[PDB]
């Protein structure tokens, strides 16, 4: 099946450089056109640059044109943008699609790799639970949840009980509090017959500051 | 380039439709002309949906259509099903500027729904740590439009609490909002009612969900 993998993303302070790469799979990379598209904090999207099959042609909008280059390795099936000259407008998700013979341009899109430009440091969040009370029970239901508050980058993926609690789940997009620093919670709804017997655990992974925690949420 | 509208909110079985309209003459029946639609639903990546002004890619449904004219191309919807929900983007790939449409966020209009509040006093870890965290939790709700409001000790807090939305359900087009009240373990520990009133259009009364500090 069709794969693209982006990576490489990371926190660069303004004036630095990156390289964010996409491996493929699925398909024969070096009949295609690639490309990588952004999407901006504000969820603006914008084609950022192409290369031909061959890596012979190449082209960018003037917003990057000649701080970003794109290239690609026929040989490893991956695609690369090194990306220089780094302003905090550049900060957004980027991804590697490729072309539809039949014409179309992005037909196949990756996961997106998150780039923030920024002065600011890493620093991995602390992991408090929201502990299900009386005042967090309605009928046969209870809530809880965790609040993964001040981290820096983004992103934070919290997940329960390793994946297997999936059903009345709320992970909450992060705000940015005054602090300069994200702050996000994650809620699951559950029968409240079920605490003091179930057990509940919120697994909080933040790859930047390498930060892994599980909490055990408990009434 | 203008797309318009920049929100539809539309119920299920309905028609929709979404438009794209350039300054230049894109559109060249017979030749060869390269607008495009893309969707992306909450937290995933954009996904193709007509190619070629009204080429469907594979696996997308026939409800969805494409057309064009001249200076405008549009998206065509026939019958909206739950699982459309999600921002629609066009693509101008034809003529230099490459550009993309700003966006128009689809919403599913349904029957309102009041929520259920929780609220959530801090921990002693946060406590430990210096500053207290209260989150009073709106679950399930529609419309979107809620408010909420921290009282401290009868007193309504101002500038000390933030709020952060869902996108809307697809299970059941419903939104859950959060809103945290933040202060320093000094000053919680300074008050001992800690109420959170939300005003929602399916509740005929506001909704106050209180704890006090500690011995309860």
């Known amino acids: 099946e069709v794969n693209l993998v982006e990576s490489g993303g990371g926190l660069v302070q303004p004036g630095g450089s990156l390289k964010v790469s996409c491996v493929t799979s699925?398909?024969?990379?070096?009949?295609?056109?690639m490309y990588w598209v952004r999407q901006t904090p504000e969820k603006r999207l914008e084609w950022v640059a192409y290369?031909?099959?061959?890596?012979?042609?190449?082209d960018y909008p003037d917003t990057v044109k000649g701080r970003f280059t794109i290239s690609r390795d026929n040989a490893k099936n991956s695609l690369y943008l090194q990306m220089s000259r780094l302003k905090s407008e550049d900060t957004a998700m980027y991804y590697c699609?490729?072309?539809?013979?039949?014409?179309?341009?992005?037909?196949?899109w990756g996961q997106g790799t998150l780039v923030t430009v920024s002065v600011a440091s890493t620093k991995g969040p602390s992991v408090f639970p929201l502990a299900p009370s009386s005042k967090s029970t309605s009928g046969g239901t209870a809530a809880l949840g965790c609040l993964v508050k001040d981290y820096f980058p983004q992103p934070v993926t919290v997940s329960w009980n390793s994946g297997a609690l999936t059903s009345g789940v709320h992970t909450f997009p992060a705000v940015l509090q005054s602090s300069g620093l994200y702050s996000l919670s994650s809620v699951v709804t559950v029968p409240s017959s079920s605490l003091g017997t179930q057990t509940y655990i919120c697994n909080v992974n933040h790859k930047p500051s390498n930060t892994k925690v599980d909490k055990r949420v408990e009434p | 380039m203008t797309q318009i509208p920049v929100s539809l909110p539309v119920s299920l079985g309905d028609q929709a439709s979404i438009s794209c309209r350039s300054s230049q003459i894109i559109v060249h029946n017979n030749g060869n002309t390269y607008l495009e639609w893309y969707l992306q639903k909450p937290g995933q990546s954009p996904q193709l949906l007509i190619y070629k002004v009204s080429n469907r890619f594979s696996g997308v449904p026939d409800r969805f259509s494409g057309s064009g004219s001249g200076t405008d191309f549009t998206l065509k919807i026939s019958r909206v099903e739950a699982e459309d929900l999600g921002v629609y983007y066009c693509?101008?790939?034809?003529?230099?500027?490459?550009?993309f449409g700003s966006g128009t966020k689809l919403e599913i209009k349904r029957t309102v729904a009041a929520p259920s509040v929780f609220i959530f006093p801090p921990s002693d870890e946060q406590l430990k740590s210096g500053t207290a965290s209260v989150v009073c939790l709106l679950n399930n709700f529609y419309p979107r439009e809620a408010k909420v409001q921290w009282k401290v000790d009868n007193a309504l807090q101002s500038g000390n609490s933030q709020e952060s939305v869902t996108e809307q359900d697809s299970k059941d087009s419903t939104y859950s909002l959060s809103s945290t009240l933040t202060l320093s373990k000094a000053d919680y520990e300074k008050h001992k009612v800690y109420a959170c009133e939300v005003t929602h259009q399916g509740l005929s009364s506001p909704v106050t969900k209180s704890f006090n500090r500690g011995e309860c």
């Open positions: 693509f101008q790939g034809s003529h230099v500027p490459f550009t």
């Open positions: 699609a490729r072309g539809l013979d039949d014409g179309a341009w992005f037909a196949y």
């Open positions: 699925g398909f024969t990379f070096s009949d295609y056109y």
């Open positions: 290369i031909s099959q061959g890596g012979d042609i190449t």
